[PDB]
Design an enzyme around this catalytic site. Structure first.
Site, mmCIF file in Angstrom:
data_model
loop_
_atom_site.group_PDB
_atom_site.id
_atom_site.type_symbol
_atom_site.label_atom_id
_atom_site.label_comp_id
_atom_site.label_asym_id
_atom_site.label_seq_id
_atom_site.Cartn_x
_atom_site.Cartn_y
_atom_site.Cartn_z
ATOM 1 C CG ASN A 115 -0.267 0.594 2.453
ATOM 2 O OD1 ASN A 115 -0.256 1.811 2.650
ATOM 3 N ND2 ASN A 115 0.284 -0.274 3.297
ATOM 4 C CG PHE A 119 0.137 9.621 6.828
ATOM 5 C CD1 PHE A 119 1.177 10.402 7.325
ATOM 6 C CD2 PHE A 119 0.020 8.315 7.272
ATOM 7 C CE1 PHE A 119 2.084 9.889 8.248
ATOM 8 C CE2 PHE A 119 0.924 7.791 8.194
ATOM 9 C CZ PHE A 119 1.954 8.576 8.681
ATOM 10 C CB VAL A 183 9.085 8.108 13.389
ATOM 11 C CG1 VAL A 183 8.605 9.166 14.377
ATOM 12 C CG2 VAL A 183 9.572 6.869 14.130
ATOM 13 C CB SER A 185 4.422 6.307 7.211
ATOM 14 O OG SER A 185 3.820 6.270 5.929
ATOM 15 N N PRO A 186 6.346 4.410 5.177
ATOM 16 C CG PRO A 186 6.372 2.186 4.555
ATOM 17 C CD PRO A 186 5.580 3.167 5.356
ATOM 18 C CG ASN A 187 3.358 4.574 1.797
ATOM 19 O OD1 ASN A 187 4.086 4.122 0.911
ATOM 20 N ND2 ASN A 187 2.608 3.798 2.573
ATOM 21 C CB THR A 188 4.892 10.750 4.693
ATOM 22 O OG1 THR A 188 3.472 10.551 4.670
ATOM 23 C CG2 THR A 188 5.181 12.237 4.843
ATOM 24 C CE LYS A 225 2.984 0.395 12.931
ATOM 25 N NZ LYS A 225 1.534 0.242 12.597
ATOM 26 C CG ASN A 254 4.630 1.268 9.454
ATOM 27 O OD1 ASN A 254 3.901 0.839 8.556
ATOM 28 N ND2 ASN A 254 4.416 2.438 10.053
ATOM 29 N N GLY A 305 2.759 -9.787 9.720
ATOM 30 C CA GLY A 305 2.584 -11.123 9.185
ATOM 31 C C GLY A 305 2.029 -12.158 10.150
#
Ligand SMILES: Cc1cc2nc3c(=O)[nH]c(=O)nc-3n(C[C@H](O)[C@H](O)[C@H](O)COP(=O)(O)O)c2cc1C
Ligand SMILES: O=C(O)c1ccccc1N/N=C/c1ccc(-c2ccccc2Cl)o1
Ligand SMILES: CCCCCCCCCCC[N+](C)(C)[O-]
Ligand SMILES: O=C1C[C@@H](C(=O)O)NC(=O)N1
Length: 366
Positions: A115, A119, A183, A185-188, A225, A254, A305
């Site tokens: 995904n 955010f 701190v 998230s791959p997506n920001t 996280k 994450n 997982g």
């Protein structure tokens, strides 16, 4: 139990996924959950599954991870599903749309998801009013061993990251049993570098000061996280800052921006964070490492997982006091929660543990 476990796994969910793309399915599922349109959750939690950590009682150790109920719309349906605690978010200070679609992808052959939501969030104000409307009901749920966590993000255009998080502490901290500073998230762009040392210390010092400024009865635990994609130096530094500042706990981990060798899904090269089975042991190893670096003194929520009792127990033995799942829910549906709890209890007896608490960190004491 086993009946609609197989029905959901073999027939219902595969049909849902054949009819709806990932994000559409996610939306519908949030709708159904908020309406209580769930299968019967017959599994009754035994005392074996109870954990006391973070200043609270958890009636079982299996939570729903952040990212499913991003805006706090389905909290009660999620308890009905059988989760021992619920984490909503990530929530950003101002509303924002997130990345353009498509932004969620299934990898069925890998039992994985990728995904890059980015955010998408209704923002603090909307979520605040949503939680306020059920605040007293949550208070009783919490007293009953069903705590609520809130995961805080930051806006894409935000100039000052610490101030975004401080706002979240001030607005939603009074409504949460625990807060998560995400701190990882791959997506920001830029977010994960908040994981470096002097920058993290400054960030978390401000977060904790804001938290300590809340009235006692409304003062949440604060957790950090982290990503599975940290260097040894990063983890070492995070462990040090966490103990220096008295951070209450860690969430590990994450999604990963790595793509492990062996992924079969056609969509494996999509940008984003990978979740589910390919993440499982990477997450477990990160738990093992952080538990050791913190001397087993910092509570860990293990995530990544988990879809069986064995998966959960491996993270607990590695050092997790609690676990969360998300991706497994998308493949197996609501029955997976009772399944994981039932298998965890059986394995605990099987391996001679009096309860979950006795198993926390047990690998490190061999
Ligand atoms: C579709 C999706 C959205 C997610 N959104 C968030 C989020 O908003 N905030 C957050 O901290 N983690 C988010 N995550 C990460 C999960 O909370 C979890 O850490 C990760 O998926 C690993 O657990 P799993 O393998 O059981 O899914 C998201 C994961 C997925 C699959
Ligand atoms: O489908 C994806 O790829 C996906 C991607 C990202 C997030 C979630 C995703 N699916 N989630 C499906 C889901 C959650 C809950 C139920 C459900 C099923 C049956 C009955 C009741 C419920 Cl509440 O189905
Ligand atoms: C309020 C500004 C717009 C924020 C929209 C955020 C997404 C809300 C619905 C969540 C489910 N999803 C859209 C990801 O499929
Ligand atoms: O923390 C997060 C943020 C989420 C998103 O992109 O919204 N994606 C993730 O996988 N983890």
């Amino acid at each position: 139990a086993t009946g609609d476990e197989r029905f959901y796994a073999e027939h219902l969910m595969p049909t849902l996924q054949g009819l709806l793309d990932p994000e559409s399915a996610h939306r519908l599922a949030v709708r159904f959950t908020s309406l209580g349109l769930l299968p019967r959750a017959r599994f009754q939690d035994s005392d074996m599954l109870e954990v006391r950590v973070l200043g609270h009682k958890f009636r079982n150790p299996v939570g729903i991870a952040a990212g499913f109920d991003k805006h706090g719309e389905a909290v009660d349906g999620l308890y009905k599903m059988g989760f021992g605690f619920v984490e909503i978010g990530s929530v950003t200070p101002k509303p924002q749309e997130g990345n353009p679609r498509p932004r969620v992808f299934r990898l069925p052959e890998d039992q994985a998801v990728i995904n890059r939501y980015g955010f998408n969030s209704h923002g603090l104000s909307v979520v605040e009013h949503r939680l306020r409307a059920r605040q007293q009901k949550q208070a009783k749920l919490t007293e009953d061993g069903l705590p609520l966590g809130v995961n805080l993000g930051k806006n894409k255009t935000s100039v000052d990251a610490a101030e975004d998080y401080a706002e979240g502490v001030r607005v939603l901290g009074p409504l949460a049993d625990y807060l998560v500073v995400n701190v990882s998230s791959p997506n920001t762009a830029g977010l994960r570098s908040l994981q470096g040392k002097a920058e993290l210390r400054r960030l978390l010092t401000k977060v904790l000061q804001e938290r300590d400024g809340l009235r006692r009865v409304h003062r949440p635990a604060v957790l950090v996280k982290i990503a599975p994609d940290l260097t040894s130096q990063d983890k070492e530094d995070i462990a040090s800052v966490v103990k220096e500042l008295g951070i209450d706990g860690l969430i590990v981990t994450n999604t990963t921006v790595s793509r492990p060798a062996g992924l079969q899904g056609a969509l494996r090269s999509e940008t984003g964070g990978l979740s589910g089975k390919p993440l499982r042991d990477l997450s477990t190893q990160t738990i093992r490492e952080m538990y050791a670096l913190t001397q087993g003194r910092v509570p860990i929520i293990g995530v990544g997982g988990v879809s069986s009792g064995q998966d959960a127990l491996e993270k607990i033995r590695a050092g997790a006091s609690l676990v969360q799942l998300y991706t497994a829910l998308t493949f197996w549906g609501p029955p997976v929660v009772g399944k994981v709890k039932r298998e965890l209890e059986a394995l605990l007896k099987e391996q001679g543990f009096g309860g979950v608490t006795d198993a926390i960190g047990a690998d490190h004491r061999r």
